[PDB]
Structure 1
Amino acid sequence: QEAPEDLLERLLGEMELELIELRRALAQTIATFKSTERQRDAQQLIAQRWYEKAQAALDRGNEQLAREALGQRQSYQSHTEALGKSLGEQRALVEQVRGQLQKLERKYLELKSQKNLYLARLKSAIAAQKIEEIAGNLDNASASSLFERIETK
């Protein structure tokens, strides 16, 4: 069986590790969110380029190539829409998790600012009875140790 005060530093160290773990995970999240945004931009750029080709093909009255290019544009338009959807979804979630991380990071040091005071008070309280045992004050003669056993011997 372990002593309760011993669990304090153990759990605080565990939490200390877990905080930086969470921070790293959120970092990786931000990274791919940026990557996905970049991909969406590239896709819509390609769609715009095909639109330019279609516009040029309509010139000179070659309507057929314009029709085929406009047909080509649709898949890229759809992919752009889907990616925009996914990003507009994810943004609020990363905002919320960032807020949570801030609050936790504050509360942690809040508790660390009192662990020490509690440990000090407990050690003082222990030391009190520690030397009250040896050589009792004899305010009452109920029990005294190590100065009466010696005296009686």
Structure 2
Amino acid sequence: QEAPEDLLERLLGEMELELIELRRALAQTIATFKSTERQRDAQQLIAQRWYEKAQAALDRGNEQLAREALGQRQSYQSHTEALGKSLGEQRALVEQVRGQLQKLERKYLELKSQKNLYLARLKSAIAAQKIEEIAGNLDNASASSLFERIETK
């Protein structure tokens, strides 16, 4: 393997490439939600416009005109009722995924936090043994033997 500390950088780098991928993907979900929201608003306005004439049709006793008008309205209502309900469910998906995203960000940053604090102990360890490696030589008849052999000389 590579120096897995380098992988810890690139592997977190992969998350950086994919964290934005989730970031862009989530935005696409929101775009559809609002776009679908408008279609509901437009339909009810037409239904309201039909109502605005049903707000004046049965007046003066033209009931049969109102019956035909309201009959047309139900089509828009049936479109309105069906379209409106689909919007509500999508909210749970966008809300939870943002919570999924928000939870991940702290985990990634918190995960990255321990990277530097923990990597230091590795650097300390290599020096700790290596500094004591040849340091241990000059005592206890290893290079103290060089201190002692020439004393014997």
Judging changes above 3 Å, is the alpha-carbon distance between structure 1 residues 39 and 152 closer, same or farther for their aligned structure 2 residues? farther
In structure 2, relative to structure 1, the CA distance for the partners of 1:36 and 1:5 (3 Å cut) is same
SS state of the match for residue 145, structure 1? helix
Identity %: 100
Shift of 1:62: 2.7
When residues 5 and 62 of structure 1 are mapped into structure 2, their CA distance, relative to the original with a 3 A threshold, is same
- Distance in 1 separating the partners of 2:151 and 2:78: 98
Q: TM-score when scaled to structure 2?
A: 0.80
- CA offsets, 1:24-46, max 9 Å, x none? 22222222212211211111111
Q: Is the 8 A contact 1:57 1:63 kept in 2?
A: yes
Q: Bigger CA drift: 3-12 or 71-80?
A: 3-12
- Whole-Å separation in 1 of the counterparts to 2:122 and 2:57: 86
Q: Deviations over 1:96-153 (max 9, x none)?
A: 1111111111111111111112222212322344455667615556799999999999
TM-fit CA distance, 1:9: 0.6
Aligned length in residues = 153
- C-alpha separation in 1, matches of 2:129 and 2:28: 53
Q: Please, which runs of 5 or more residues in structure 2 have no aligned partner? A: none
Equivalent residues of 1:135, 1:146 under 8 A apart:
no
Give the secondary structure class of the aligned counterpart of 2:106. Answer: helix
Aligned-pair distance for 1:77? 0.3
Judging changes above 3 Å, is the alpha-carbon distance between structure 1 residues 150 and 51 closer, same or farther for their aligned structure 2 residues? farther
Contact 1:54–1:69 (8 Å) recurs in 2: yes
Residue 134 and residue 65 in structure 1: after superposition, are their counterparts in 2 closer, same or farther (change >3 A)?
same
For structure 1, the residue ranges without an aligned partner over 5 or more in a row are none
Q: TM-score, normalised by structure 1?
A: 0.80
Contact preservation (8 Å) 2:138, 2:147: no
